[PDB]
């Protein structure tokens, strides 16, 4: 049933004290191979991990893409008969669902439906990455690259790329730096 099964393995979140956290997987990583097994989809990763564990393999190579490069890690294979998990969740695509009125993002004209491609020159894949980069900004200027669909009377939508610089503000809700963006979650 769950839709993510057929999707690429882009990591949206890494659980505290998981195998994934301990071996150094990060939100935004894309898992592409383990031992072997090609990883195209989450279902591929699930089935690979199950088989490895049934075969007694205790640790193996994990390959992933981070910031446009391929890294390899040594991963502890979770024990399927103990119901152990790796500790990763699927992505939240970095499409803007809401903009807080008056926020830094609203001030630079970011709109619902914008796709955030890049933060501080680095490509992002999942929302949490934007959250963490902004949190770490210390209130200093950050740069975003956005893609925006543009209506063209009597023709298909076009797309434009815009680069924007803004200063994160501290959010009185959380006490962390933010820019006033919220993702589409449907």
Curated annotation (Swiss-Prot):
It comes from the Bacteria. It is found in: Cell inner membrane. Residues 74-148 form the PDZ domain. Belongs to the peptidase M50B family. This is Putative zinc metalloprotease aq_1964. It comes from Aquifex aeolicus (strain VF5). The lineage of its organism: Bacteria, Pseudomonadati, Aquificota, Aquificia, Aquificales. The chain holds residues 116 to 292 of 429 of the full protein.
């Amino acid at each position: 049933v769950p839709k993510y099964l057929k999707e690429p393995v882009v990591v949206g979140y890494v659980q505290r004290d998981s195998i994934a956290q301990k071996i150094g997987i990060k939100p935004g990583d894309k898992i592409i191979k383990i031992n072997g097994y090609e990883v195209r989809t989450w279902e591929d990763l699930r089935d690979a991990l199950i088989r490895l564990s049934l075969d007694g393999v205790k640790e193996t190579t994990l390959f992933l893409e981070r910031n446009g490069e391929v890294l390899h890690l040594t991963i502890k294979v979770p024990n399927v008969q103990k119901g152990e998990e790796l500790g990763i969740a699927p992505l939240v695509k970095p499409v803007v669902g809401g903009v807080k009125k008056g926020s830094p993002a609203d001030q630079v004209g970011i709109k619902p439906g914008d796709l955030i491609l890049e933060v501080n020159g680095k490509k992002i894949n999942t929302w949490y990455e934007l959250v963490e980069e902004v949190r770490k900004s210390q209130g200093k200027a950050i740069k975003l690259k956005i893609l925006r669909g543009v209506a063209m009377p009597g023709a298909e939508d076009d797309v434009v790329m815009i680069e924007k610089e803004l200063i994160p503000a501290k959010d009185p809700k959380t006490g962390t730096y933010f820019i006033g963006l919220f993702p589409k979650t449907e």
